[PDB]
Amino acid sequence: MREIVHIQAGQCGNQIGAKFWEVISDEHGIDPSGNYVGDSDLQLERISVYYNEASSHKYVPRAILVDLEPGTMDSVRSGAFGHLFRPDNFIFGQSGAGNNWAKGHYTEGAELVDSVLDVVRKECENCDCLQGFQLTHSLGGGTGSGMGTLLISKVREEYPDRIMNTFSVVPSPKVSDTVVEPYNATLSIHQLVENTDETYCIDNEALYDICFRTLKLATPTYGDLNHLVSATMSGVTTSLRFPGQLNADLRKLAVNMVPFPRLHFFMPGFAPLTARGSQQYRALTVPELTQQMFDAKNMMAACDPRHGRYLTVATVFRGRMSMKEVDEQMLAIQSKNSSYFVEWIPNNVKVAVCDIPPRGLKMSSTFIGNSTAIQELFKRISEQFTAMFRRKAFLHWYTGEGMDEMEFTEAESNMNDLVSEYQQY
Amino acid sequence: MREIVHIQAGQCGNQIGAKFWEVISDEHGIDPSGNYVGDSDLQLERISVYYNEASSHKYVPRAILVDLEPGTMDSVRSGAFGHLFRPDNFIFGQSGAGNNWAKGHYTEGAELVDSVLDVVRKECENCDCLQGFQLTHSLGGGTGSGMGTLLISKVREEYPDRIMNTFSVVPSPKVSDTVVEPYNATLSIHQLVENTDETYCIDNEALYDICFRTLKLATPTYGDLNHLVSATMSGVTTSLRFPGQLNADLRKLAVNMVPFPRLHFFMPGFAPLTARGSQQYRALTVPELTQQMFDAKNMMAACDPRHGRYLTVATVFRGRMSMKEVDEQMLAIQSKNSSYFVEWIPNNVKVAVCDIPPRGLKMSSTFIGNSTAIQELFKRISEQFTAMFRRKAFLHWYTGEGMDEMEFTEAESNMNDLVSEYQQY
Amino acid sequence: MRECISIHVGQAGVQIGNACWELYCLEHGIQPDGQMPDSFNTFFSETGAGKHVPRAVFVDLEPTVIDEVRTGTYRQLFHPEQLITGKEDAANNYARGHYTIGKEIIDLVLDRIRKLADQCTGLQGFLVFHSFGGGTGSGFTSLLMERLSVDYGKKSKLEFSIYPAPQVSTAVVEPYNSILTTHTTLEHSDCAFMVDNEAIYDICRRNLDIERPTYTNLNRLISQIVSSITASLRFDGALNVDLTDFQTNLVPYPRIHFPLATYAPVISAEKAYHEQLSVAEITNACFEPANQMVKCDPRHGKYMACCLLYRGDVVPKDVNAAIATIKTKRSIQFVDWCPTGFKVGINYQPPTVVPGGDLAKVQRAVCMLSNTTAIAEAWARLDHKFDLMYAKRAFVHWYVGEGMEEGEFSEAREDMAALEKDYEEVGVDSV
Amino acid sequence: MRECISIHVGQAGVQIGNACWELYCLEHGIQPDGQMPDSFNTFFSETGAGKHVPRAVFVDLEPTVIDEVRTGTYRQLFHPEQLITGKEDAANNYARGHYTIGKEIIDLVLDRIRKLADQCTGLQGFLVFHSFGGGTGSGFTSLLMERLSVDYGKKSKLEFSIYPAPQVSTAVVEPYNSILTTHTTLEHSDCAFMVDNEAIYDICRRNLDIERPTYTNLNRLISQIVSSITASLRFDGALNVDLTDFQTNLVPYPRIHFPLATYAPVISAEKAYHEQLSVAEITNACFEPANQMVKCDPRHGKYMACCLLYRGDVVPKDVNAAIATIKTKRSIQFVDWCPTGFKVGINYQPPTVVPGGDLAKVQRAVCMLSNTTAIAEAWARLDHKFDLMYAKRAFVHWYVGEGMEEGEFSEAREDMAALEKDYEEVGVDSV
């Protein structure tokens, strides 16, 4: 019932997906060997949305791990929770596409996407009522960006009515981890605009800021960043899964935050983020959670909402809390920041409340924000893309793989249309 | 009661028959020395269809092992379950016929077929109610193809009303194990069309695909392939032997899958095929068995059913299962694949259900398919045969043994008539 | 005195007989060995001691099902000579069960039935349990019915047949066997109470909360239907109904004799606890189109005769009020030539719950045998499938090479066309 | 005899039904398993034994809330077949609950409601509990009400709806769903008793001393309102008032049928100890603008009809004196075309205190249903929000790509404008 197919593409996607399945198994009380060792019945009440029951009551995640290099597959398999995924769902190639969008979308992406599409078709036909798909990847990468894009397009043309939502790691503003990041990001965004229902844009530098300033982590590794992203994913599909006072699945959130088809890029967030030192001085209340989630420092994308206006927001609360406090905090937030919300949408907040909090917490909440400040991120990508494209730098790789400059022009025109739409609204 | 005479001809036939008798003795709890060491009474309830009770309550298989070379006889006798067959039922010659159909059908096949016919007459006159015969052989071989053909013809003209069904290993599409494979296969098929009731076409390359892709066997040997073929044979005659909710002997299957006398070539299959790694993640249910048996990857002949239309299918289920689930799965399969079933035969599925599953399993099922995709196999054989025959390659062997080119022309004309009939229907 | 003989042919018939005789032994207090720790006379015979031998034969051309009977918990209930079995079944072939394999067994079956009839004093008739789409359930059933008509040309012959389902099907040659059986037995039968496996599956899922029923639950429901039908012979009630009553009140014309069976209080334990199942409620459930045990929508046709067999704590006034309510309904329409289309039977014995079954213990129940023109659509579907398969001439060689001719195929199809025409004619209003 | 069926749609409706049926079981002495260690007949049915099955359906498109009901303390009270649930909710989308997801469930709900109606003898009407700003609470509620009007075109249909609050809100698309529901149900409804979560929050804070109330306390207060409304059917009193009485006395024109609910003795234990709550005091509290459970100031409009439902130790003379005092007040103004704007009902049963609740045990209580033109301001606010969101065309793609057209949006907005015009017209004085 309302089964979700999870696809992890590339190194970033595979690592974030491994952390995501760790936190999900923690929520549902699933042993790293696949056995249920939980305590409450609500964990197995809706285990079907993410897991498939095998023969000996062992739960196999409904996840497809796709990459163009075997190193990440070996790392995921060898580590903890690596004996959890189905061994037939590791679909990988040998050559790793470099950091080339064209390689991952046109040359090796073809064979690997045929194989992964067969696997995805099997997984979907196994499902009872498919709610939709979720993809984890990075736009600035190689196999990640291009292959996630190709899979998104093909699954979309196969299943147009399902909800396709992606948790994509966007390029950072200050320091880039890939020289050709603008090209891959621009092409990936051009493809994501038309074939995705919900794109949660995550930047690693905002995550570094959160870890250093809010969690006071001296040496934040990728494990902590992936844990944060996994907590966001958790929160959303937990509103989907567990019982609550005000339920909301993926489609309800999509309806309440996508006023127009192309305006589906969100800044995620997580409210109860405290350092180990300050956990004893802070009161965990709905006002505290709301004040933190609406703070511009907590948002997981390096886009200041004070530079734009919130088209819509979604607050997915978790835990036993009073609906009056949630609604009054929402009203106070809208009244105080009336200049930061769009006037032509009254009640720009969609509230969902789930009864089961995450492990180790009494209250929690995730913030999703459809704001016109993503236009800043797309503008940065556009300036970098046009700076490299004007002098035609690193372009012979993409051209030789089989692309054309016309595709680059179309991608940049589509992204400029996106920024124009955001600025207009 | 309903005794079956089993004849193994050639190397392929003898090895597959050895594996078959191993699995049958496992099913009926027969010691490799011939003694009953089982647990349930149903094993001895119908032991008579395959075994003959000897003096000291020792069960001798009703099997005739015929070959034109003594190496296979020695290998079968020396190995485990080799002291099970009657020593008077090893009928072999010295010269091994090479890979020549004419040698095994006209020169040495004559003397050896007189001897084996005497043995078969003794075995049949010993029987109480003969249900029919079953032959294991290879069409691309020497003594196997030609001698199995000669024995089939002679036993057919002796016992026309009995059921003669053969499990023949057909040539593979990609790689051939014998240079003269098309000649032997064409002559054998020309003789099988008129003198056989049920020919289960098995290709070694489909078996390799099953072992590598479905069973994840790193080094599949002929033991595993023979085990698969033996499981298919088991399933069929187990529907014959053990009690069930919906019984079906050999003749019932023959009636329900042979709409026309010459259209009796089947693609066998086996549903519960799982790798040792994935046995814990898979739920053993009737829908799972049906989905696997109707999958084009599971079928044991390299002929894609999506390239043709199923004239008829037979599902022989084994184990305690609900008849409603079986019937609803059959109906769903027919409705979903309505384009892959013949329109002029409503209810193209014949369902049989036996109560006793194979050892080590809770549920099982064998798939038999009379489809118009065997025409692809016969077409490949025809192209290869005409390619070699046009330039008269390797023909002087067959001519010198005592044949004529007119026999080759008749064989290819008959096989072309077979492909014409399949394409017409 | 009113002894009746039940004949179970084929696997379906034998398993339904297993369920039926389990139910009879439970109802009459007979232990599964025939001993008791009259009412039990129309179906059982006493042999000196407390041994009660059921008045039935179990005939099949396959040793498997009969051997399961011979070694089951009821191994010592049935007379060993009345469990007749062959060696090779009919293999879903009508010709095998009627011409080739059935001719080697029919004499033994007739001898055993003659022994049973001689043991009786007044023979009411025969109950033939079989399936339409089976080899021995079709060919041997038709052969046996014709031989019985030759011998007992006056006793009623009621048959409980599993009509092929509209969509689900376990055999490929079911239309051939069904059409040929309909031909041959329609020549020589009184009335055939019909049932579908698909409809009982739907009933089980919707009412009994079972998502994975087997043939066992279907057989238990069918046995409940048969028990409700024969309660009047087996017990005492306000309004008794005999087999001849069924034949007279349900068959308006000699060929139109295919009523559909129904059973209202099909309910689980918890739902039965939460309900107050009364005469009106069970009658309305009987006339609900979703509770029919033959997958034919009654709203597509007109009722010509209904036989409501109540049992248990039932009051005649409540039955009359419920039937008046049904008649006042507008969705339920009758043919214009049957102003009185209700035969009512009331029995004082409430239905007996089988230990291990799914039906809950109820105070009253009703079985409704309805002859309706909605079965004409099912006949049309069956003959359409027959027409497709025969136009391609598929599987015809199996029948022809076994003592039959294609002329018989054509004649059976023409007879079925005549039956469809008869249903159409009786459907239309008089002018 | 005067049986009434309550229908709970969506999460809000199902949870309010949980509170309501807890209150009913406590009032009638029924244990949470349906057994008791008449009055309990308009809302419960007896099944043979002491089992009392409530006469209600719990329908939602989401398994979560219904499954909480199925496994709670009342797991064995409700009939398992009357707890209808879907697989995927309407996701705050009217189109999903009305066109796409609601069409796969409406037949089952109608079948269950037909079963309940047949089980009844005289059906007074339906009580529909739902929320205005929910997916299934709007779309499925409108669909169900229209189907009921098609089927039961004469029985009264009273709906208890959670009107969206002026400021607090849990969903972003509430104006769309509210306007579309108002359109569709306003076509096919008798009267809608309205309530706001924000107003009940304010009532709880001011009167019950609770600073952190949950939905549970709100549901308990709403259940008290419903119990006061249905006490006349469930108990005996000096002045009985039926559902048709509500419909007649509260609805002056077919479209103006949105009264506001109120409950006077909302008080904690200590404050109840220190007070002497009498008929005059509770009546004055009912007419206090701060005690309204819909956040609309009554002084901004004119009353057109009031329904004072007293219960407990209430004397008719005291009620008359209190109502005369209210009429002599100058802050409370009525429309000039209603010289008599008071329907009075008195019941002998004092309100029952739920163990674990916050309301104190009182000797008397009054529920006031007031139809007033102050709801016109709330309608104006709702349509203003709708106009903003529709002018930007936000979220419209979600509705359109689910079986709806923008023409329906325009038509619903025009209908709401007509409703505002009607309220303005009935507000003005006659000349």
Which residues of chain B make contact with C198, given a CB cutoff of 8 A? 327
- Asked if residue C65 lies in contact with residue B247, where contact means CB atoms within 8 angstroms, the answer is yes
- Binary contact (C271, D80; C-beta < 8 A): yes
Please, what's the b/e burial string for B14-41 (b: 16 or more CB within 10 A of its CB; e: otherwise)?
A: bbbbbbbbbbbbbbbbbeeebebebeee
Instruction: Please list, residue by residue across D421-431, b when 16 or more beta carbons sit within 10 angstroms of its beta carbon and e when fewer do.
Output: eebeebbeeee
Closest CA to C197 of C293, C285, C297, C92: C293
* Contact across the interface for D49 and C276, Cβ inside 8 Å: no
Tokens of B47: 């032991």
- Please state the length of chain C: 431
d(CA A208, CA A220): 7
To what resolution in angstroms was this structure determined? 7.7
Chain C 58-97, residues with CB within 8 Å of chain B CB atoms? 62-65, 67-68, 87-89, 91-93, 96
Angle at Cα B277 formed by Cα B274 and Cα B278, nearest 5°? 50
* Residue type at D47 in one-letter notation: T
Cα separation, C299 vs C313, whole angstroms: 30
| CA separation for the pair A161, C346 (Å, rounded) | 56
Exposure of C331 by Cβ count < 10 A (0-12 exposed, 13-18 middle, 19+ buried)?
exposed
Query: Burial code of D346-371, b = ≥16 C-beta within 10 A, e = fewer?
Result: bbebbbbbbeebbbbebebbbbbbbb
How close D411 gets to chain C, by Cα (Å)? 37
d(CA D323, CA D310): 12
CB pairs under 8 A between B and C: 134
Alpha-carbon gap, residue B9 to B15, rounded angstroms: 9
Beta bridge partners of D369: D307
The burial of B359, by beta-carbon neighbours within 10 Å (0-12 exposed, 13-18 middle, 19 or more buried), is given as: exposed
CA C84, CA A187: separation in Å to the nearest integer? 78
B251, B330, B355, B422, best to mutate vs chain C, most C CBs in 10 Å: B251
d(CA B194, CA B263): 10
Query: Euclidean distance between the first and final Cα of chain D, in Å?
Result: 46
Interchain contact, C273 vs D118, CB within 8 Å: no
Chains adjacent to A (≥3 CB pairs closer than 8 angstroms): B, D
User: Which 3 state secondary structure label does DSSP give A64?
Assistant: strand
Residue C378 burial class via C-beta count within 10 angstroms: exposed 0-12, middle 13-18, buried 19 and up: buried
Q: Does B282 touch chain A (CB under 8 A)?
A: yes
Interface of D with A in 155-184 (CB under 8 A): 165, 167-175
Residue of C104, C168, C393, C402 to mutate when probing chain B, most B C-beta within 10 A: C168
Backbone angles phi, psi at A140, to 5 degrees: -90, 0
How many residues are listed for chain D in this entry?
A: 431
Angle C10-28/C215-234 helices, nearest 10 degrees? 50
Q: Which two tokens stand for residue C252?
A: 């308006």
B3-257 topology per CATH: Rossmann fold (3.40.50)
DSSP state of C39: G
- Partners of A238 on chain D (C-beta within 8 Å) are none
Considering only CA atoms, give the Rg of chain A.
Answer: 21
CB neighbours (10 Å) of residue A360? 8
A34 chain-B contacts, CB cut-off 8 A: 280-281
Neighbours of A356 (CB within 10 A): 18
Among candidates B249, B323, B328 on the partner chain, residue whose Cβ is nearest the Cβ of C91: B249
- Helices B181-195/B405-424 angle, 10° precision: 60
Residue A306: both structure tokens together: 């004070």
CB-side exposure of A94: number of CA atoms within 13 Å?
A: 0
Distance CA A201, CA B165 (A): 64
Q: Is the Cβ pair A54, B277 closer than 8 Å?
A: no
- Tell me if A252 and D93 make a contact (CB, 8 A cut-off): yes
**Residue D51 is nearest to which of C274, C281, C284, comparing CB atoms?**
C274
Q: Is A83 exposed, middle or buried (0-12, 13-18, 19+ CB in 10 A)?
A: middle
Residue A348 near chain D (CB below 8 Å): yes
Q: Which residues contact C11 (CB under 8 A, 6 or more apart)?
A: B245, B246, B247, C60, C62, C64, C65, C131, C134, C137
Q: What is the dihedral of CA C424, C427, C428, C429, to 10 degrees?
A: 170
Q: Does A45 touch chain D (CB under 8 A)?
A: yes
Residue that has been written with the tokens 């039977």 in this structure? C345
Residue of A nearest to D169 (CA): A327
Same fold, A265-374 and A375-425: no
DSSP C102: G
DSSP A299-368: -SSS--GGGS-EEEEEEEEESS--HHHHHHHHHHHHHHTGGGB-TTSSS-EEEEEES-PPTT-S-EEEEE
Q: Where are the domains positioned within chain A? A: 3-257, 265-374, 375-425
Q: Can you say how many angstroms the Cα of residue A66 is from the centroid of all Cα atoms in its chain?
A: 16
CA distance A375 to chain B (A): 45
Give C262→chain D minimum CA distance, Å. Answer: 19
- Closest residue of chain B to A59, computed from CA coordinates: B281
Token representation of residue C298 = 């009654």
Q: Which residues pair with B366 in a beta bridge?
A: B270, B316
Are the Cβ atoms of B278 and A88 closer than 8 angstroms?
A: yes
Please tell me the distance from the alpha carbon of residue D307 to that of residue D344, in angstroms, as a whole number.
6
Q: In the numeric block, which tokens belong to residue B400?
A: 């010198």
Max CA pair span of chain B: 61
Minimal C-alpha gap between C274 and chain D (Å) = 6
How far is the C-alpha of C312 from the C-alpha of C353, rounded, in Å?
13
Of B243, B323, B346, which is closest to C215 when you measure between CB atoms?
Answer: B323
Token pair 């399945």 in the structure block, residue: A21
Q: Which residues of B touch A52 (CB under 8 A)?
A: 281
Q: Which residues of C touch D49 (CB under 8 A)?
A: 273
Nearest to B99 by CA among B19, B15, B176: B176
CA distances from D55 to C275, D7, D62, D349 (A): 12, 9, 21, 21
Angle at C124 between CA C121 and CA C130, to 5 degrees: 125
Residue with structure tokens 């019941």?
A: D347
Query: How far is Cα B175 from Cα C67, in angstroms, rounded to an integer?
Result: 50
Q: Which residue has the tokens 């006037």?
A: A343
Instruction: Compute the distance between CA of residue A15 and CA of residue A221 in angstroms, rounded to an integer.
Output: 12
Count of beta carbons in the 10 Å neighbourhood of residue C420: 16
| Alpha-carbon span C424 to C401, nearest angstrom | 36
D405 by Cβ neighbours in 10 Å (0-12 / 13-18 / 19+) ranks as exposed
Residue written as token pair 């398999």: A77
Which residues are bridge partners to A364 per DSSP?
A318
Which site among B274, B281, B336 would you substitute to test the A interface, given the most A Cβ atoms closer than 10 Å to its Cβ?
B281
* Nearest-CB residue to A255 (from D88, D175, D395): D395
**Chain A residues closer than 8 Å to D135 by CB:** 252
Cβ–Cβ gap B258/C213 under 8 Å: no
Closest approach of A286 to chain B, Cα-based (Å): 41
Chain D residues touching C275 at Cβ < 8 A: 47, 79
Backbone angles phi, psi at A300, to 5 degrees: -85, 5
Integer Cα distance of A49 and A247 in angstroms = 15
Which of D30, D46, D79, D108 should one mutate to test binding to chain C, selecting the residue with the greatest count of C CBs within 10 A? Answer: D79
Q: Rounded to an integer, what distance in angstroms lies between the CA atom of residue B243 and that of residue B45? A: 9
Residue with tokens 């077949």: D81
Helix (H, G, I), strand (E, B) or coil at A91: strand
Positive/negative CA dihedral, A34, A40, A45, A50: negative
Question: Which chains are adjacent to chain B, needing at least 3 Cβ pairs under 8 Å?
Answer: A, C
Rounded Cα distance between D366 and D287, Å, is 11
CB C295 within 8 A of CB C198: yes
> H helices then E strands: how many in chain A?
15, 12
Residues tagged in the binding site annotation of A for GTP: 11, 69, 138, 142-144, 204, 226
Of the candidates B108, B67, B96, B101, the residue with the CA atom closest to the CA atom of residue B184 = B101
Say how far apart CA C139 and CA A335 lie, in whole Å: 84
Could you count the other beta carbons within 10 Å of the beta carbon of residue B386?
15
Structure letter (DSSP) for residue B48:
G
Structure tokens belonging to residue C93? 């072939």
- Look at residues A192, A300, A310, A315 and name the one whose alpha carbon lies nearest to residue A253: A315
Give the Cα separation of D406 and D398 in Å (integer).
11
Mutation target for C interface from D81, D84, D107, D112: give the one with most C CBs within 10 A: D81
Work out whether strand A51-53 and strand A59-61 pair parallel, antiparallel, or are unpaired.
antiparallel
For B199, phi then psi, to 5°, come to: -110, 115
The phi and psi torsions of A246 (rounded to 5 degrees) equal -145, 100
Distance from CA of A41 to the nearest CA of B (A): 21
Helix residue spans in A175-267 (DSSP H): 181-195, 204-209, 222-241, 250-257
CA dist., res. A74 & res. D403, Å (int): 47
CA torsion D179→D184→D186→D188, rounded to 10°? -170
Which residues partner with D127 through β-bridges? Answer: D6, D158
Q: How far is A240 from chain D (nearest CA, A)?
A: 10
Please give the full DSSP string across D80-100, using - where no structure is assigned. GGGEEE-SS--TT-HHIIIII
Spatial distance between the Cα atoms of C250 and C304, rounded to a whole number of angstroms: 8
B375-425 under CATH 1.10.287.600, yes or no: yes
State the amino acid at position D8 in one-letter form.
H
- Is B279 an 8 Å CB contact of chain A? yes
DSSP D147-197: HHHHHSSSSEEEEEEEPPPSS--S-SSHHHHHHHHHHHHHHS-SEEEEE-H
CA–CA separation, A417 and B13 (whole Å): 70
Q: Which residues of C touch B425 (CB under 8 A)?
A: 392
Which residues in chain A are contacts of B296 at CB distance < 8 A? none
Q: Which residues contact B14 (CB under 8 A, 6 or more apart)?
A: B8, B65, B67, B72, B73, B75, B76, B136
Query: Would you say A168 and A199 are in contact if contact means Cβ atoms under 8 Å apart?
Result: yes
Task: Examine chains C and D and say if they touch (3+ CB pairs below 8 A).
Answer: yes
The amino acid present at B197, given as its one-letter code, is D
Q: Do B252 and C92 count as a contact with CB atoms less than 8 A apart?
A: yes
Rounded to whole angstroms, what are the CA distances from A352 to A332, C67, C94, D135, D343? 17, 63, 65, 13, 41
Q: Choose among D73, D24, D77, D5: nearest CA to D47.
A: D77
Q: Which of B306, B321, B290, B256 is nearest to C399 (CA)?
A: B256
Q: Are strands C303-312 and C364-372 parallel, antiparallel or unpaired?
A: antiparallel
B119: Cβ contacts below 8 Å, ≥ 6 apart: B64, B88, B89, B91
Count how many Cα atoms sit within 13 Å of the Cα of residue C152 in the half-sphere of its side chain. 22
Q: Among A236, A350, A195, which Cα is nearest to A4's? A: A236
Sheet holding D303-312: strands in order across?
Answer: D342-347, D303-312, D364-372
CATH of domain A265-374: 3.30.1330.20
Q: How far apart are CA A104 and CA A402, in angstroms?
A: 11
For chains B and D, tell me whether 3 or more CB atom pairs sit within 8 A of each other.
no
| Burial (CB count <10 Å: 0-12, 13-18, 19+), residue D157 | buried
Binding residues of B for GTP are 11, 69, 138, 142-144, 204, 226
Task: Tell me if residue D124 falls in helix, strand or coil.
Answer: strand
Contact B277 A55 (CB under 8 A): no
On the CB side of D64, CA atoms within 13 Å amount to 26
Going by C-alpha positions, the residue among A142, A131, A104, A133 that lies closest to residue A11 is A142
